[PDB]
Amino acid sequence: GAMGSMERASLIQKAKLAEQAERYEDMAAFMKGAVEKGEELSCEERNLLSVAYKNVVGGQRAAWRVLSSIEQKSNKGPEVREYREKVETELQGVCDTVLGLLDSHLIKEAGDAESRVFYLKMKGDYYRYLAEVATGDDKKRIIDSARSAYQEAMDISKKEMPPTNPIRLGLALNFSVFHYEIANSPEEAISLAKTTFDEAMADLHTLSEDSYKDSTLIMQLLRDNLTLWT
Amino acid sequence: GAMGSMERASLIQKAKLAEQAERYEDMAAFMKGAVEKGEELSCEERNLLSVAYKNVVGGQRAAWRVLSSIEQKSNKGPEVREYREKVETELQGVCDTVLGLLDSHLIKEAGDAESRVFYLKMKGDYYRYLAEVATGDDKKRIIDSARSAYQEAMDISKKEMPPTNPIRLGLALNFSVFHYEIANSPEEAISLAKTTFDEAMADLHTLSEDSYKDSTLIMQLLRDNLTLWT
Numbered sequence: 001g002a003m004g005s006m007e008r009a010s011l012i013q014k015a016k017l018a019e020q021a022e023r024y025e026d027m028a029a030f031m032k033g034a035v036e037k038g039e040e041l042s043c044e045e046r047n048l049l050s051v052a053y054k055n056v057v058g059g060q061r062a063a064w065r066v067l068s069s070i071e072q073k074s075n076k077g078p079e080v081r082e083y084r085e086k087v088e089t090e091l092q093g094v095c096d097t098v099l100g101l102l103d104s105h106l107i108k109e110a111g112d113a114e115s116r117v118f119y120l121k122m123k124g125d126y127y128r129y130l131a132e133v134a135t136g137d138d139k140k141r142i143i144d145s146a147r148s149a150y151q152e153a154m155d156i157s158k159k160e161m162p163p164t165n166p167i168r169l170g171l172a173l174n175f176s177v178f179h180y181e182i183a184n185s186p187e188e189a190i191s192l193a194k195t196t197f198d199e200a201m202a203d204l205h206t207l208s209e210d211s212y213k214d215s216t217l218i219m220q221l222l223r224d225n226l227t228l229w230t
Numbered sequence: 231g232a233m234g235s236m237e238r239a240s241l242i243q244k245a246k247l248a249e250q251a252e253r254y255e256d257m258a259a260f261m262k263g264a265v266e267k268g269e270e271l272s273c274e275e276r277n278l279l280s281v282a283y284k285n286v287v288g289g290q291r292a293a294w295r296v297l298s299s300i301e302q303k304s305n306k307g308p309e310v311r312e313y314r315e316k317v318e319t320e321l322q323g324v325c326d327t328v329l330g331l332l333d334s335h336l337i338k339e340a341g342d343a344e345s346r347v348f349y350l351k352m353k354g355d356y357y358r359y360l361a362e363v364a365t366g367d368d369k370k371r372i373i374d375s376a377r378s379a380y381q382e383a384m385d386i387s388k389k390e391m392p393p394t395n396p397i398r399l400g401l402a403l404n405f406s407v408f409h410y411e412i413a414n415s416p417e418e419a420i421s422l423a424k425t426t427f428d429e430a431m432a433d434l435h436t437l438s439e440d441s442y443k444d445s446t447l448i449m450q451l452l453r454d455n456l457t458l459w460t
């Protein structure tokens with residue numbers, strides 16, 4: 001790789017500087033380099049990886065939506081289709097890269113439950129992004145790959161984590177978005193979101209000092225989605 | 231070039247779609263392709279060229295400032311200097327490209343006064359951006375190149391345009407920023423900004439329907455700078 005000659009510690013240091021400069025493509029490329037050294041990621045390093053790639057595909061998804069909607073209003077030439085296809089191909093490339101890193105280096109049968117749930121949630125998120133732009137018989141394959149990763153993550157977090165854990169809360173929030181937008185199961189989405197909120201409020205005594213901010217933010221987002229789906 | 235096989239009309243169409251999707255790198259590359267066909271740009275096309283490249287270098291300048299300030303707080307390793315140099319080199323590449331297009335294709339002895347002033351202002355803006363990151367004896371050469379382009383633009387706009395013309399107003403606004411930030415002449419900056427505002431207000435009867443929005447915006451920015459420099 002292009003980062004093969006740089007020290008692991010230097011790549012992590014530069015990913016942080018790229019975050020502060022809002023240079024998210026650079027950030028993602030530095031973290032890919034770090035992962036390719038073959039060592040495990042710390043809790044802090046996992047978050048750098050996630051923030052980098054989330055910001056890159058987020059910008060691609062927003063552009064793809066603007067162009068896809070303009071394309072449909074034509075019903076002008078081949079130009080809109082051509083440019084929409086170009087952004088699509090680039091988005092698919094980024095998703096394939098992240099999923100490649102998850103299968104090659106990061107997902108393991110061992111490690112703590114925080115680690116395994118984090119990478120399986122990530123695996124679900126990026127199959128979900130591929131599902132938003134797919135159409136064929138492969139779309140059905142992609143949706144079942146997303147559901148499967150999300151469901152194994154849910155099973156582990158119910159056994160191993162308290163209901164106020166922010167990784168458990170975020171997982172359930174995104175899996176409920178999967179139900180509503182991709183699976184067309186709005187009842188199953190509403191249900192999952194309400195019980196996630198309710199079960200956290202019933203066992204507030206488990207709330208940790210170090211994740212008061214993160215957990216609270218995700219509770220508000222769960223409620224905002226329920227307001228919208230009523 | 232990479233856009234050599236595409237029709238002129240298709241490149242202009244795709245630059246507009248890229249604007250709507252906030253894909254400013256694509257936008258700039260499509261407009262470079264359009265310029266390289268060798269025909270003049272319309273008023274609307276000139277604005278597409280300007281908006282594309284302004285947005286690209288704007289993001290680079292903001293990152294360069296965040297990293298340059300972090301670097302100075304070290305007084306930790308070579309990592310901050312190395313990454314700051316990388317963003318700098320990339321910023322200089324974009325400025326050289328724009329200045330190359332201006333000298334090769336766009337700046338002419340003929341054409342209307344709106345055209346000539348527009349490209350000379352652009353020439354000043356991008357030498358100004360190179361001056362922000364330069365240090366040596368070449369910095370002095372770069373500042374004099376910026377002043378010279380800006381001054382020839384001012385001379386033409388005073389003879390050929392009314393004092394409420396938004397291209398004339400924008401030119402003077404940016405030339406006053408050049409005085410304050412790059413030339414360290416805060417008196418000369420304050421003076422130019424006040425007389426630009428005052429002379430527009432004295433001759434309000436020249437204000438055009440098609441530029442009421444643009445001219446008004448730039449008047450407010452001239453006043454906001456004066457509030458700051460008092």
Ligand SMILES: O=P(O)(O)Oc1c2c(c(OP(=O)(O)O)c3c1[C@H]1C[C@@H]3c3cc4c(cc31)[C@H]1C[C@@H]4c3ccccc31)[C@H]1C[C@@H]2c2cc3c(cc21)[C@H]1C[C@@H]3c2ccccc21
Nearest residue numbers: 166207208209210211212213214215216217218219220221
């Ligand atoms: O240092 P931490 O334990 O990791 O948590 C704090 C943070 C921060 C803190 O200070 P700051 O937000 O003024 O910049 C704090 C904390 C701890 C110490 C201080 C703070 C303040 C507060 C809480 C925890 C913390 C509880 C009570 C108060 C608060 C407001 C909103 C939600 C949760 C809380 C920064 C840095 C970090 C943080 C996180 C966020 C945000 C900002 C921060 C933004 C985006 C996200 C967030 C969630 C909810 C509301 C607003 C935000």
Ligand SMILES: O=P(O)(O)Oc1c2c(c(OP(=O)(O)O)c3c1[C@H]1C[C@@H]3c3cc4c(cc31)[C@H]1C[C@@H]4c3ccccc31)[C@H]1C[C@@H]2c2cc3c(cc21)[C@H]1C[C@@H]3c2ccccc21
Nearest residue numbers: 396437438439440441442443444445446447448449450451
């Ligand atoms: O169609 P145009 O003649 O080119 O001008 C109008 C515009 C627009 C118009 O509608 P909009 O701003 O509600 O979206 C208008 C015009 C003409 C017709 C309507 C409008 C409204 C107004 C004016 C001119 C126009 C004068 C009086 C009122 C106004 C408010 C602020 C500054 C100047 C004006 C859009 C599109 C365009 C425009 C430009 C701007 C903006 C928005 C627009 C933003 C960013 C910049 C701006 C400058 C000052 C304040 C706010 C803005």
Ligand SMILES: [Cl-]
Nearest residue numbers: 082083086244
């Ligand atoms: Cl294209």
Ligand SMILES: [Cl-]
Nearest residue numbers: 014312313316
């Ligand atoms: Cl670097």
